[PDB]
């Protein structure tokens, strides 16, 4: 058996509402650590727009399947990424702390009604433009023989990725994103993923 | 060879107890051995020292100060506090032994653990939406340990079962641990030392004996260890992970079992259940006895 | 029927007194006498020797002239005309002692505190004389010495667990069906445990939540009767209810100068039958149930839902019998009043019983249908009626009030012309209620009389007077269960019945007794289960801190009573509003960019208030008041807190 880590960063292009109170406050805060309060991406919303432009792609398939675990009755296979909670990088926050940058922002915006031409009024925490998380991904290598097959068709995802957007409301402008992968090692296993890229 | 082994956690954990929507803050021995075993079976190592030779306790929390145990279930000679208290450091567990602990330093004791903090993260599921209808939301919960906290445990087992202990842990420090581990929760990193406070304290002789795992005895040690004894039978139960059990997910045979910090008198050794039913591979659940003895 | 006769007697034995008001012992043996039914023996002997020796014995041991000319002409007609002697006919005679004369005083015209009520002292000295008679049948200052009496209490295991296993997908249902069957659950235990030593429901000292305290002979027969109960309902428990609920029953044998606090030993008994109980409570198990336990067989396909079980056969929506007759029994508890223990009906109950709510059609039908079928009238102080018990609840519900509100349910609360749509969630209870048991009575007026009045009052305020103080609120209570209290409805109907409900709580027990809230909003969509959480941590962190405190809202907000009612809605909020209806040029959005300037930390932020006041055109006393309250923080706070109630209000 084996696994291999994926680390990296996920730059922030434009504001991301990863999503998850009182009166003219922020109607939608996004997702937080509980203890030091910054924004992070929960991992399921990596793996769920991962899973989503795989299949699209492709297109229930052996494929999306087997790389991000199946139920289903007969077909039971466990999920071969593990994509961890990317965590808020400790270099934007001192680019952050500097600057007096707030971490997140409020967005406000507006939805002009088709009926009686009103208005309604929508604070959105969006992570600021320019924030790094440092994301984190597990592959567990079940069959040798898939490997590369497979790590292909992450690189599709994450390629689909870089052209769509992360949690949000991203066909309004919020979340898109770049994956600059740090490295590919090898942490269980005598698996060699040298020669394995997601970008 | 007792070896403690100190997890700190990197991403929140899940650690249900009984739903999703729960999170309890540590797991019972035989959960951690049910991962062991999973993970021995991936690394297609052999399992016969997990089963006939590994004493592992529960995981207990431990912060910058002070590592934690359960708090025994001894008579009290105000109750409301004590019965909140449920973690005793190991500094002041020989005084609360002999009772030296008062209703306020119980609650500053109670409010001394600064484990970690639990929250509810809602996930929605969009699987339906492609096709026809609409998105599932549904909530796990989480807990979060503060940065200089974790989770430890005690293994004891030969020198081999300990090397392949290390193995696992090291595994497991990415497969992830508690549920959820396949959606970004339960990642860690894991320490495996020599304890030199823990050993002192475990090689202590006392009147009585207190359970540091979730653990049950068979029939013949059941008819001796029941002898005014003060104990917790928590119900533990949950679905079988495996691929090679079943078409459909199937559930374990229900379980019964005396919780950590439990005091008996007589102490006994116990059995690892199998709790299969009609599948191709046993399921097995820990639990062996792992014990403390103190005087009160 | 010598044992019955005594009854009579010990619990007649002071209708002199009233009799006189209108040597009292005389007076009450010719009323007496004065019907014939009430002519036996045991009765006349118990109240011309009370002034028979077993009735004396425990005598021992335990306004205007024209109101009581008025209750003597009234006790004379429900004697004539509803009371018989009989067998099954006492719990009617005890219902009428507890009705009638609650508000008339045991003992008048006395330097000592007339504290103690009739119906108290009456219903102590009928519980004494049963135990002494029944140590007799078993076979003065030597009697006292002797031990006479066995303290029992009764303690239910996971009623918080039981309340809250519910899965939010018929929360509300099985919240308040929970409750309700766990009370009536503990009623019906009661009343077994009675029938089977032979007692009347005097000697059942008094029922909290989850909780019995009642006093039994010393006798080999009565120690073996709860020896025979304790094994049987611990079967039981464990049959139905795995680990997931459980009683634990513990005893104390006393001499006759314990009950008298001689020698101050009262505490230190009460005391000692808690650590028994605790004892118990921590065993909790045997050998045998263990082994059964753990030799289950076959693993089972599917579970309940909520119950979360898979070997009860469990239905096609998948809901165990249990469970879906909890959610069944949930819309009757409340749809109708009595309750019949029967042999058969919705929910499961002890002796191979079923509890189901039924009209008084329903329980007289399953009364002629089949005998050994229990009543209980629910909240109604009628005592004609036979073989039935007052059982009180507070099944308030303002959707239920008309039929498409009863269908809807809570969510018509959120239906609202005005204000915010938004439902607020209460979760209630009391602060130092076991320390007020303990050592709130000094130890010269401590009396099982005492401690009796306390919990019935307070039992009678949680369940039966909620509902008058509710009342005209769209509040739905999920549940009043023992001391605490789980309400529902609109946000504004939630807040302002929680501070009726402490300003008569203060007025209640002379504001000897606190108890902390919490109140949370939570949208109409937004699940129960959530609701329950969250308004259950806000409580948690009210009464982390001293005493009483309401934990409005955020975490952030935790306040007082005083300071919610007065120093947040009544000083603040009130010139706030009038502000904004009289002035015909400022509206909400001036009132968001003074929250928006409060709630800035920057210290120039209050200047920019400052600037604002000074062209808000507001009253001049309005502006200096305001400023005043952002200057300062807990009036800052204040000033925020009442500027977000008021917005909620005036939304849409
Ligand atoms: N039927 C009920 N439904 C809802 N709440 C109740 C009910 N009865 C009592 N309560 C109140 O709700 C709480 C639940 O009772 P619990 O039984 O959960 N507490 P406790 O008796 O201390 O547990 P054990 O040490 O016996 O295992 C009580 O403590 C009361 O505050
Ligand atoms: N309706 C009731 N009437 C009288 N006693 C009750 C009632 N319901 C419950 N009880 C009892 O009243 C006690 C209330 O206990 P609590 O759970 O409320 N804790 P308490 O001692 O009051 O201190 P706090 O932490 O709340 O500040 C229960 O433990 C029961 O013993
Ligand atoms: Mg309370
Ligand atoms: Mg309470």
């Known amino acids: 058996y084996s696994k291999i880590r994926i680390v990296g960063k996920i730059d922030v292009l434009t504001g991301l509402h990863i999503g998850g109170s009182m009166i003219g406050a922020i109607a939608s805060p996004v997702v937080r650590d509980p203890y030091s309060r910054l924004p992070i991406i929960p991992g399921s919303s990596i793996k769920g727009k991962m899973r989503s432009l795989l299949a699209k792609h492709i297109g229930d398939a052996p494929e999306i399947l087997r790389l991000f675990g199946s139920s289903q009755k007969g077909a039971i296979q466990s999920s071969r990424l593990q994509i961890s909670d990317a965590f808020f990088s400790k270099a934007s926050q001192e680019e952050f702390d500097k600057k007096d940058l707030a971490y997140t922002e409020t967005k406000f915006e507006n939805t002009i009604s088709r009926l009686t031409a009103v208005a309604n009024p929508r604070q959105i925490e969006r992570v600021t433009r320019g924030a790094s998380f440092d994301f984190h991904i597990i592959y567990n290598v079940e069959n040798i023989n898939e490997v590369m097959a497979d790590f292909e068709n992450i690189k599709t995802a994450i390629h689909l990725l870089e052209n769509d957007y992360l949690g949000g409301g991203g066909t309004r402008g919020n979340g898109r994103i770049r994956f600059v992968i740090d490295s590919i090692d090898t942490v269980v296993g005598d698996f060699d993923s040298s020669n394995l890229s997601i970008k | 060879v007792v070896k403690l082994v100190k997890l700190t956690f990197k991403s929140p954990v899940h650690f249900g107890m009984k739903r999703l929507s729960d999170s309890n803050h540590t797991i019972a021995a035989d959960t951690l051995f049910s991962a062991l075993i999973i993970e021995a079976l991936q690394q297609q190592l052999e399992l016969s020292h997990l ?39 190991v500094e002041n567990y020989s005084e609360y032994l002999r009772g030296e602990i008062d209703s306020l330093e119980a609650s500053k004791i109670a409010e001394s653990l600064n484990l970690g903090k639990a929250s509810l993260s809602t996930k929605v599921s969009l699987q339906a939406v492609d096709h026809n209808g609409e998105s599932e939301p549904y909530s796990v919960g989480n807990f979060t340990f503060y940065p200089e906290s974790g989770l430890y445990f005690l293994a004891k087992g030969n020198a081999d079962t300990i090397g392949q202990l290390e193995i696992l842990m090291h595994a497991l420090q990415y497969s992830g641990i508690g549920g959820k581990r396949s959606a970004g929760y339960g990642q860690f990193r894991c320490t495996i030392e020599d304890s030199g406070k823990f050993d002192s304290l475990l090689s202590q002789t006392g009147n009585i004996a207190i359970l540091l795992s979730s653990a049950m005895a068979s029939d013949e040690e059941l008819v001796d260890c029941l002898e005014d004894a003060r104990y917790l039978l928590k119900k533990r139960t949950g679905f079988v992970q495996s691929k090679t059990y079943a078409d459909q997910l199937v559930k374990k045979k229900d379980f019964y079992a005396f919780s950590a910090g439990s005091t008996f008198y007589q102490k006994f050794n116990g059995k690892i259940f199998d709790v299969s039913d009609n599948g191709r591979h046993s399921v097995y659940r820990y639990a062996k006895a792992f014990w403390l003895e103190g005087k009160i | 029927n010598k044992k019955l006769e ?143 009496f066995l303290l029992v209490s009764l303690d239910m295991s996971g ?27 503990l009623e019906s235990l009661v009343d077994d445990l009675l029938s089977d030593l032979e007692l009347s429901r005097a000697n059942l000292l008094y029922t909290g939540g989850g909780h019995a305290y009642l006093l039994l002979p010393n006798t080999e027969r ?154 209980y009238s629910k909240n109604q102080p009628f005592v004609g009626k036979q ?76 369940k039966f007077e909620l509902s008058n103080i509710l009342k005209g609120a769209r509040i739905s209570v999920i549940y009043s269960g023992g001391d605490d209290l789980f309400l529902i409805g609109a946000w504004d109907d939630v807040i302002s019945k929680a501070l009726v409900l402490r300003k008569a709580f203060t007025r209640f027990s002379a504001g000897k007794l606190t108890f902390s809230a919490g109140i949370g909003m939570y949208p109409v969509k937004y699940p129960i289960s959530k609701m329950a959480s969250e308004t259950g941590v806000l409580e948690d962190l009210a009464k982390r801190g001293e005493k009483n405190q309401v934990a409005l809202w955020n975490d952030s907000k935790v306040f007082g009573w005083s300071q919610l009612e007065e120093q947040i809605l009544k000083e603040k909020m009130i010139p706030l509003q009038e502000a904004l209806t009289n002035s015909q040029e400022h509206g909400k959005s001036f009132l968001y960019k003074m929250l928006e300037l409060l709630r800035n930390e920057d210290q120039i932020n209050i200047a920019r208030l400052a600037y604002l006041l000074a062209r808000s055109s507001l009253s001049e006393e309005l502006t200096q008041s305001i400023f005043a309250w952002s200057q300062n923080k807990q009036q800052k706070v204040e000033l925020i807190t009442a500027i977000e109630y008021l917005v909620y209000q005036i939304r849409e």
Request: charged share 25%; proline share 3%.
């Open chain 3, 222 to 375: 009565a120690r073996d009767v709860l020896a025979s109960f304790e094994g049987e309902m611990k079967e039981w428990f464990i049959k139905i209810f795995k680990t997931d609920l459980s009683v634990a029953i513990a005893y104390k044998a006393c001499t006759g100068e314990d009950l008298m606090n001689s020698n101050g030993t009262y505490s230190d008994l009460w005391q000692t039958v808690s650590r028994k109980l605790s004892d118990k409570k921590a065993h909790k198990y045997s050998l045998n149930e263990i082994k059964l336990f753990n030799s289950t067989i076959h693993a089972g396909t599917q579970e309940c839902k909520e119950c979360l079980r898979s070997d009860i056969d469990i239905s096609e929506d998948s809901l165990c019998k249990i469970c879906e007759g909890i959610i069944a029994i949930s819309n009757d508890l409340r749809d109708y009043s009595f309750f019949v223990v029967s042999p058969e009906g919705k929910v499961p109950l002890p002796r191979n019983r079923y509890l189901s709510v039924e009209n008084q059609d329903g329980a007289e039908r399953k009364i002629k249908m089949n005998k050994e079928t229990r009543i």
């Open chain 2, 51 to 89: 089963l006939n030779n590994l004493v592992i306790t529960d995981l207990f929390p431990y912060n910058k100060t002070s590592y934690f145990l359960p708090k025994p279930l001894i008579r009290i000679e105000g109750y409301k506090a004590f019965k909140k208290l449920t973690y005793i450091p």
């Open chain 3, 159 to 185: 009623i918080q667990d039981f309340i809250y296993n519910i899965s939010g997908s018929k929360a509300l249902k099985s919240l308040r069906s929970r409750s309700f069957y766990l009370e009536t659950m």
């Open chain 3, 387 to 462: 073989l039935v018990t007052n059982l009180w609840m507070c099944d308030y519900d303002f959707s239920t009030l008309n039929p498409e509100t009863k269908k809807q349910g809570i969510a018509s609360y959120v239906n609202r012309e005005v204000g915010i749509p938004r439902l607020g969630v209460l979760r209630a209870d009391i602060d130092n209620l076991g320390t007020t048991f303990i050592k709130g009575i000094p130890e010269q007026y401590r009396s099982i009389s005492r401690t009796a009045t306390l919990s019935r009052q307070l039992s009678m305020f949680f």
């Open chain 3, 6 to 148: 005594l009854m009579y007697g010990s619990l007649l034995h002071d209708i002199g007194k009233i009799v006189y008001r209108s040597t009292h012992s005389k007076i009450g043996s010719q009323f007496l006498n004065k019907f014939k039914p009430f002519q036996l023996s045991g009765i006349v002997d118990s109240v011309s020797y009370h002034h028979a020796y077993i009735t004396y014995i425990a005598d021992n041991i335990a306004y205007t002239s024209s109101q009581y000319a008025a209750l003597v002409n009234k006790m004379t007609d429900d004697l004539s005309n509803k009371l018989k002697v009989g067998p099954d006919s006492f719990s009617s005679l005890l219902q009428w002692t507890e009705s009638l004369w609650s508000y008339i005083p045991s003992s008048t015209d006395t330097n000592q505190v007339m504290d103690v009520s009739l119906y108290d002292h009456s219903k102590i000295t009928c519980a004494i004389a049963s135990c002494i008679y029944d140590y007799l049948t078993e076979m003065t200052k030597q009697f006292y010495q002797e031990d006479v």
